Every structure is written in structure tokens, then in C-alpha cells.
């Protein structure tokens, strides 16, 4: 949404389930080379940064898909930042 | 509580009942992949470190849940660090 | 099939007989170094990810072989995802 | 097309898959010295500028080829700027 | 062959056994500094790009050797692109 | 402040948390192209130089924001140079 | 505007986003030969002087366009010099 | 102290209790991202190098804290280098 | 010998007793940091590659030592490649 | 030789081991400022042109030295252009 | 001093820490445009020549400051040329 | 010594223990920014080239120290090139 880009610096630090979001987004948005490129950089925030590297090329129609994925996996930190 | 993050270095070394706390937190907070990921690393404190890897994504409504679980299982070490 | 790549995210989580599939595919498709490389990463889905790392190099003639192996081992989760 | 030169300032900023366009266009249009020359300038838009340096030497028959490449790789940002 | 330069963009993406080709080509063609330089860049296609950087310095008498090595390791993807 | 430009040569050498300051300053002052341009130049002070390249374009109303960010992350080196 | 020529010596020194202004003014005002000619002279103010070399061939109808570009990119240094 | 920087090359090789010092220094000096960044690099001295990467930003008031932690854990190698 | 560098690609794959050769070479040739660095990378050939990383710095006087160690441990694969 | 100046246009494009030729020629012919000056211009042929800038100051007695260096490193592209 | 202009040709070739001398002299003597202008010309001595372009506009009261900077950074090449 | 500059091209290729030489030379000769700058460029000889970039700034009194370090760590390649 605009919630993703609005709360960018907070979602960099408190998300700990990248490995599942990658499988949720595979095929639909992220190509394979980017999927392999994200699986590196052991520092966990770096996976988030490298993931947000492909955010500027997204329209309003798929950031919503990622927000649904976050609402299926966590659904608590989403509510934590919403409140 | 704030007691959990306040007394981290003491709770890493002196908690010896991970195998039950994992069952207390299952379904409610911990997903299945993280649950399988904790059951490794034979060094007993390392399971505690892997558990605290998921602490930053916790709100005030579930750290209390974990302290309740510790007051049901141990209830003396909780009192030992409280005093 | 195209069913293997179509239901990838579901097959990552619910297949629990990797140690036999590896023996089914040995000699025919997987070389020895890859076979030794898969037997690591205690987190059970990670073996599945390491297995799908070698999938892009598969044609229509061997993915069918893997679906045959799954129909010999599980044959219920295959039936569970087909329905 | 004329869409490439019409939306230049938008395509400079929102394209994040240059490393694949180079291989799609290799041999057909871009010589090798240009291919090695693009793989520099870490600032990602700078690869786009260095690529548009070779646009004036293109006819109507190959800018269409590049639009096909974008419709095969992204096909969403293309649709985002079309609408 | 000329098959190597003919199917460059396809061979960038679908080859997953670089770690063995390196040992096949060592001593005969590739010097040691290039051998150490290839063992980097975790993105798997980048190893392929850095490898094809040394392709222009090859005559007709050694690309045949590399195709033989590819026919000894995979022997299916060679057949997959041949058909 | 005037403290930022007053102690420039000391702050070039002893700051080790650039990757977080960028996320604190993102959206508000630094555009995205500069953000991508800073994540280069492995020599750690060079990130500081490239960051101070955009300092002359700052008024009194945002250097205060950067000093607040330094007082939230480090809060000791700020205190170390103040004393 | 007349603000541009009124504050010439201040806008020579404190503008750090030439690389975007060029893309804002491209096609509308600046021809391509000047666009390539400005991208030289590593000293950043020299790009500004070379840009103001083309100010005399501008009417009241396009300096306004450039001030709009500065109000979209920076919008703070403009406000800093206005006050 | 000055003893930490004076005997740097000796403390790189003979300290084998990083996993505990990290918990001793957590919250007080090391932020979370650096704590996650140290827990990598299987080569045991590399954790020491990555830890000393954050040493130049320390005043006299916390290097003493680290020497106290070393005197509580080891208390023999400190005495070994002192004598 | 020259047999070590001559049969490199065969010795990468068929030696399965690294943990003993390391003890044979300790103190005499390998320093301790390299010894710790080799005991990683679970894929068994990777220990061989990391071991041959230190081969170019060997004279004729110690590669013979390694061949004697292999003739004490294996003495069949040595004979298998000799014949 | 006269082969160097005779096959200049072929040796500009297909030589990919400049970084070693520099060390082969160091001390004997190239001064230090030229040695540092060649290590720039990421485009690989540009190092070749900057290298041939110093060819006119060479007699018949050192172009032979460079041909010897090329026959020691590559010895196949030399053979490829000889035939 | 007069030592700077007396040993100019020796200080052109053997100084390897320009990037710090610039920060030592910044604000006091060097303006910002000269600071940006020196940071070019990859050939390391060229930064030294461009630096000595501004020596003629210096009195006896600041060449002493620059010699102090050299005695704080190197203090050996100063000592090497003094002896 | 003069042995260091005489056998430069041989010491570029056959030394594999840079990570220890850096700690031997730290504080005494190499400043910290150069120390951080050397720990890059994954190609093992490139660390050596970046190291010899600072060699011209060494007198007869410290190259001896570096040869002592080489005789303490390796003491075999030193003897190998001496003979």
C-alpha cells in the first residue's frame, strides 16, 4: 500500500519472516535471479533492504498483494504498526 | 514484560525447560518452521538465542504470555530474578 | 510436471520424505556432490529449497519421474493437492 | 517505439532489470565493448543513461525489439506507464 | 562451439554445475587468478557472466573441450537446447 | 547544527552506523538516487564524504534533524565530542 | 523567473541535483548535444556554469518551467533563498 | 583501556569466549544489527575483527567495561598478557 | 609431488579422510587459523578446495610430506590413481 | 615485435590478462606513474589503448620482451593470430 | 615551510595519504570548490600537482600548518627526507 | 629489504596469509583507513596490489620489519625465493 512506503524504516527492523514472503511472492512479481540474490547477506535487515530494492518498480496492484501476505503470516506487527 | 528484555543475559544461561515453553508458545505465536528451526543446536543456550531471535517482533500482549508460561513452569527462577 | 512448479509453495511445507526422494533420484539426475550438499540444513523445508535449486535445469522428461516417485512414496499429499 | 523516447524520464528511474536486457539485446544490436562498458557505474540509473547513449543509432525496427524485451521481462511497469 | 555463442542468453540461466566445469577447465585454459576471481559473486548467473568474459579469447580448438565437459556433466540440457 | 560542520574532520573518522542514518534521513531530505549512490565505496569514511557532499544543500532546519538522529543512535560519541 | 537571475551566484554553489534537472528539462528546452556536453567537468559547479551558458536563449515562458523543476526536486533551498 | 588497543594482535588470537562477551555488551554498547552481524564468519578470529570494527568509536568509559567483562569470564589470559 | 597438482580434479572427489590429514599437517605446514578455517563448509569437496587454496605456497619439500601422509592413510586410492 | 604493431587491432579486443602483463613489464620498461595510470578506465580495451600509448617509445629490444610475456601467459591467442 | 618547496619533486612521488591531508587543511585554507576539484585524476601524483597549484597563494604562516599535518600523519617520510 | 622490491612479481602470486600481516603491521606503519581499504577486492592478489600501493612510502627501516613478519609467519616461501 502507501502503508508499506510510509512505515519503511520500521518494517526494516521488526520483520523476521522473509524466507516465507519470498515463496509467497515467487512467480508473480519477483523473477528468479532476484530470488537467488536476496538469499544472501546474513545480516537480516540486509535481506529487507535488497527486497525493497525492487519496490520502486511496483504499482498499486501488487503492493496490496504483499500486504495480504504480511496479513497472512504475521497479522500482529501489521496491527502493531496500524495502532 | 520489560522484565524479559531487562534480564536477558541471566535468562540465557539459567533456563533449562525449552522443550515445554516451545509447546506453550506453539500455534499462538511461533509458526511451524521456526518451531522446527529451534529444535537443533545442542548447546542449550543456543536454543535460547534462536528463541530471542523472534523477540523483536513481539508486542506487549504476548511477552506477557511468555512470562505467564515461565511462571507456570519454573516459578522459582522467575522469583529468583525478581528478588 | 507443470504441477510441480505450479504448486511449489505448497510442496515446500508439506513433504516430509526427502531422505527417500534423494535415493529415488540418485544416479539418474542428481550427481553425487549435490546429493552430499542436500544432506545438511536441519530445518526440514531448507532441504526442499536446496532441492528446487536444481529444478530449472530439468526438462519435461524427468520432472514426470519425480512426480512418479512422489506417487510411490506419499500418493496422498499428491492426491491432497490434486483435489 | 516512440513510447521509449516519449517516456524517457520515467524509464530512467523505475527500471531495475538492466542485467537481463543486456543479454536479450546482445549480439543483435549492442557490440561487445558497449556490453562491457555498461557493466560499471554502480548507480543504477547511470546504467540506464549509458544505455540511452546508444539509442539515437537505432531505427524503428529494433526499439520495437526492446519493447518486446520489456514486455517479456517486466510487462507490469510497461502496463503501468501505458495506463 | 558456435553453439556456445549462439545460445549464450539461454546458457546463462539454466546451468547449475559451474563448480565442476571450473575443475574441468583448470590448468588447460583458465589461469589461477581467474579461477579465484570466479569463486565470488553469490548470484549464480554472475559466475556465468564472469566466465563468458574470458570466452572472446578462445579459438575453435578449446570451445569444443568446454562443450565436451558440458556433455559429460549434464548431457540433458545440451540435448534440451539441441532439440 | 554548526556542530556538524564544526567537527567535520572528527565525525568523518569515528562514525560506524551510516546504514541506519540513511534510513533515518530517507524520504525527508535525501532522494532515492542519492540513497542508492551512498551504498558503495567500501572504505567506511568514503560513505561519510559522499554523505557530506549533500550537506551544503542543508539549512538550519534539517541539520538539527541529523543531530537528533545521531543522539538517538549513538548518544555517546555525540557526548564524547561535546565534552 | 527573475529569481533565478537575481540569485545566480547563490544557485551556482548550493544546488546538488543537476543530474535530475537535466532529465526534467530534456526534450522541452535542451537539445541533446548540450545534454552530452554538460555531463563533463567533474567539478559540480562547472556543470552549473555550463548550464547557465544556455540561460540567455530563454524567454519568460521556460525559466518558470525550470523553477517548477527546482520546486519539485528541492523545494527547500528555493524556500531558503526566498526567505 | 589503552591495554585493549595495545595488545590487539594478541587478543585477536587467544580469546575464545565471544559468544558470552556479546551478551555482556548487549544493550549497553552494541546495537542489535551489529550483534546479528558478529554472529557469522565461522573462522573464530573473524568475529574478533568484526567486533573491533566498532572499537574506534569508543571512549574511555566503555572499553573499561569490556576489560571488566574479560576479567569476569577469562581472568587468566588477562593475567597472562599483563605479566 | 607433481602428482598432487597433476591429478587435482580426481583428488578433489575421492578423498574422504580430511579430518586426519589435517592432524598430519598441523604445526608443520598449516598455522592454526587456517586449520580452523578448513573445519567448515560441510560439502566434503569444499574442504578439499579450501585445502588446495594453500597449495601454491608449497615447495617440493612439503608436498612430498602430504603424499607420504596419504600413503599412510589411504594407500589404495594413491595406488588406484597411480595405476 | 613487428607482430605487435602489425596485429594491433586484433590485440586490442581479445586480450583479457592485462593485470599480469603489467607485472611482467614492471621495473624493466614501465615507470610507476604509468603503472598506476593504466589501472583505471573499467572498459577492458581502454587499458589496452592506454598501454599502446607507450609503445612508440620502444625499440626492437623490448617489444620482444613483451612478446615473450604474451607467449608465457596466453601462448594460444599468440598461436591463434600466428596461424 | 621552505622544506615543502625545497623537496617538491620528492614529495610529489612518495606521499600516499592525500585523502587525509585534505581533511586536515579543510576550512582553514582550502575552499570547497578546490576540495571537490582535487578529488579527481585517478593518477595519485596528479592530486599532488593540483594541490601544489595552490601553494603560491600561501604565506609562511600556513605552510608550517601543512608540515605539522605531515608530521602527524607520516612523520617517517618527513624524517626520511630530513635525514 | 631490496628483496621485497626485487621479487615483487613473485610475492604477488604466492603469499596466502595477508590477514595476519595486516595485524602485524597495524599501528606501526599502516593507518586505519588503509587497513579497512585492504580488506576488500576478493581476488587474493588484489589485496597484495593494494598493499604495494603503499610500499613506495616505506624507508629502509620498516621494510625490514615486513621481511621479519614474513620470516615469522611463512619462513618457507621466504626461503624458497632466497634459494
Numbering used by the authors:
A (entry chain L), B (entry chain D), C (entry chain K), D (entry chain H), E (entry chain J), F (entry chain G), ...: 112 to 194
Reproduce text from the manuscript describing this model.
Inflammasome sensor NLRs can be grouped into two categories based on their DDs: PYRIN domain (PYD) and caspase activation and recruitment domain (CARD), both domains were found to form filamentous complexes to initiate the inflammasome formation. Extending this analysis, we also found that specific type II interface motifs directly dictate the compatibility of heterotypic pairwise CARD-CARD interactions among NLRP1, CARD8, NLRC4, ASC, and CASP1.
In both structures, we noted a similar internal density bridge on Type II interface as what was observed in NLRP1-CARD and CARD8-CARD complexes (compare Fig. 5a), which had not been highlighted by previous analyses. In ASC-CARD filaments, this bridge consists of two residues Gln185 and Tyr187, which extend from the Type IIb surface and interact with Ala168 and Asn170 on the Type IIa surface. To do so, ASC-CARD must engage upstream sensors, self-oligomerize, and activate CASP1-CARD simultaneously. For instance, instead of a prominent negative Asp residue in CARD8 Type IIb surface, ASC-CARD uses a less-charged Asn residue to enhance the interaction with Ala168 on its own type IIa surface.
